[PDB]
Amino acid sequence: DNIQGITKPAIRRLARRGGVKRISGLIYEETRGVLKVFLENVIRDAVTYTEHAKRKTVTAMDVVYALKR
Amino acid sequence: DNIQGITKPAIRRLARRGGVKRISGLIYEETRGVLKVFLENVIRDAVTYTEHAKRKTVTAMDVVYALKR
Amino acid sequence: MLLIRKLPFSRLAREICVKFTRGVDFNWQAQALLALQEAAEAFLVHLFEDAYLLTLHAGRVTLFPKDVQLARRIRG
Amino acid sequence: MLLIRKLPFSRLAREICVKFTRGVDFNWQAQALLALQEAAEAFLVHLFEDAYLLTLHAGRVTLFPKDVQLARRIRG
């Protein structure tokens, strides 16, 4: 609950911040897909590292470690 | 001594192995440049790691470590 | 500054976490969920910049999914 | 199998090493110089494959330096 909560205006504005003014309508589902894959990998690694450390709360340093991979 | 020893036929054949049959004449110096940068980084890291280990001979495992970065 | 609303983002993160964890009890520091969102948005921005280089390479001004897929492929 | 001759490659590697080291005495195992060359050639091959995706994206069949530069830029 839920990838569809990443809205069309959010996506246009992210593309805009990256210097892209015009996008295909197909970009909405493309961005959703890319984002889900990125989070699946980072979250997996962040939580794995929290578990290796025998902790129950994922911290900013756990996320930073995950990102570094 | 010496980047020019990476020959034109070597470069064509590397491009060919990567599925590229036709290259611009400009590709020869482009490949030389890319190769030099790659080796500068890998060699730097491999030797740094040999030094950190207080050793005088760069090994295959030193190179493998460098590549992993 | 962040473009995605924090609540939709956190619901998506938690959902992905639970699918990985299959119910092991974890929770997130607010500073953790923020770090994650900041990095996610920066990732999307820089991917948009890379993919737009390919749009221009194709002689276009409109980003197509092929531009984003090529950028992803070349990334890793 | 390796496309670059081993002696030209080893001279280039040693030269780059000495420029970094500025004369600190190091030497290479034969298996080290081989590992390095194998990885260097595989790197060039895969870069050629990535860059050729961009050639086709530009509607061409001849690899141009812009294709290789874009691939490098997008890599990192």
Side-chain angles (χ1 to χ4, degrees), chain A residues 2-60 62-69, chain B residues 2-60 62-69, chain C residues 2-76, chain D residues 2-76:
Chain A
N2 191 70
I3 190 64
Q4 302 296 295
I6 311 301
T7 66
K8 295 190 284 156
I11 292 165
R12 290 198 296 274
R13 295 169 188 153
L14 284 161
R16 196 168 303 122
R17 181 166 277 169
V20 183
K21 307 256 185 82
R22 311 149 193 87
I23 64 171
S24 170
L26 288 165
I27 292 300
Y28 298 120
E29 287 293 312
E30 175 72 28
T31 310
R32 293 184 182 119
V34 191
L35 179 60
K36 180 174 183 292
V37 166
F38 173 94
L39 297 170
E40 287 172 330
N41 293 324
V42 174
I43 288 167
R44 182 225 302 116
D45 295 342
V47 182
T48 297
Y49 187 84
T50 308
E51 171 69 21
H52 189 254
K54 301 292 160 270
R55 285 185 288 101
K56 238 39 171 149
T57 303
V58 184
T59 70
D62 291 349
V63 174
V64 165
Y65 180 94
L67 293 161
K68 301 279 191 67
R69 310 169 66 98
Chain B
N2 191 70
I3 190 64
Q4 302 296 295
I6 311 301
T7 66
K8 295 190 284 156
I11 292 165
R12 290 198 296 274
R13 295 169 188 153
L14 284 161
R16 196 168 303 122
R17 181 166 277 169
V20 183
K21 307 256 185 82
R22 311 149 193 87
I23 64 171
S24 170
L26 288 165
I27 292 300
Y28 298 120
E29 287 293 312
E30 175 72 28
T31 310
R32 293 184 182 119
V34 191
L35 179 60
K36 180 174 183 292
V37 166
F38 173 94
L39 297 170
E40 287 172 330
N41 293 324
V42 174
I43 288 167
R44 182 225 302 116
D45 295 342
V47 182
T48 297
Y49 187 84
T50 308
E51 171 69 21
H52 189 254
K54 301 292 160 270
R55 285 185 288 101
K56 238 39 171 149
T57 303
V58 184
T59 70
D62 291 349
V63 174
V64 165
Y65 180 94
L67 293 161
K68 301 279 191 67
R69 310 169 66 98
Chain C
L2 286 166
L3 299 174
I4 302 162
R5 308 278 295 246
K6 276 196 176 55
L7 193 54
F9 181 86
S10 84
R11 285 166 175 176
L12 176 59
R14 187 156 282 114
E15 173 189 25
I16 289 178
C17 189
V18 169
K19 186 165 155 53
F20 171 61
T21 261
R22 303 276 147 171
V24 183
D25 220 309
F26 278 95
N27 55 55
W28 286 72
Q29 289 191 325
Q31 293 92 352
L33 278 168
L34 180 66
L36 183 64
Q37 197 175 345
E38 284 185 331
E41 292 195 19
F43 166 76
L44 291 178
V45 172
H46 189 218
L47 183 61
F48 280 128
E49 307 177 338
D50 283 350
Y52 197 63
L53 300 171
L54 302 190
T55 302
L56 302 173
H57 193 63
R60 289 183 277 94
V61 288
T62 307
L63 186 74
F64 282 8
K66 188 51 183 285
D67 304 325
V68 185
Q69 301 156 358
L70 279 173
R72 284 170 72 166
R73 173 108 137 90
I74 297 176
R75 287 286 191 80
Chain D
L2 285 166
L3 299 174
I4 302 162
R5 308 278 295 246
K6 276 196 176 55
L7 193 54
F9 181 86
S10 84
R11 285 166 175 176
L12 176 59
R14 187 156 282 114
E15 173 189 25
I16 289 178
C17 189
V18 169
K19 186 165 155 53
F20 171 61
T21 261
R22 303 276 147 171
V24 183
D25 220 309
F26 278 95
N27 55 55
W28 286 72
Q29 289 191 325
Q31 293 92 352
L33 278 168
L34 180 66
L36 183 64
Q37 197 175 345
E38 284 185 331
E41 292 195 19
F43 166 76
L44 291 178
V45 172
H46 189 218
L47 183 61
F48 280 128
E49 307 177 338
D50 283 350
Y52 197 63
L53 300 171
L54 302 190
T55 302
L56 302 173
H57 193 63
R60 289 183 277 94
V61 288
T62 307
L63 186 74
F64 282 8
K66 188 51 183 285
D67 305 325
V68 185
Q69 301 156 358
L70 279 173
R72 283 170 72 166
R73 173 108 137 90
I74 297 176
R75 287 286 191 80

